[PDB]
């Protein structure tokens, strides 16, 4: 689809909300992420920040590619909220 960083605005930090202090972490692993980086995002500035920004920089790190990955561990409540809220 359009890239995930393709919203340059507070939508993204609305995210922050959504992809809360956990739930985040099993989708960056499953968005290709090494464990490592799963680490250094949670110290990182915030982790849906550096995130959002650094994911949203790789190939086709589509919104419904970041849905897709949420879809798979069923937390399809951040993605209908992603679809728009």
Partial sequence: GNLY?????????????????????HLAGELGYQPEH???????????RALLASWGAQDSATLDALLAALRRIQRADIVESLCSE
């Fill in 5 to 25: 960083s393709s919203l340059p605005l507070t939508k993204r930090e609305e995210v922050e909300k959504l992809l809360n202090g956990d739930t985040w972490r």
């Fill in 38 to 48: 799963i680490d250094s995002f949670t110290h990182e500035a915030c982790p849906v």
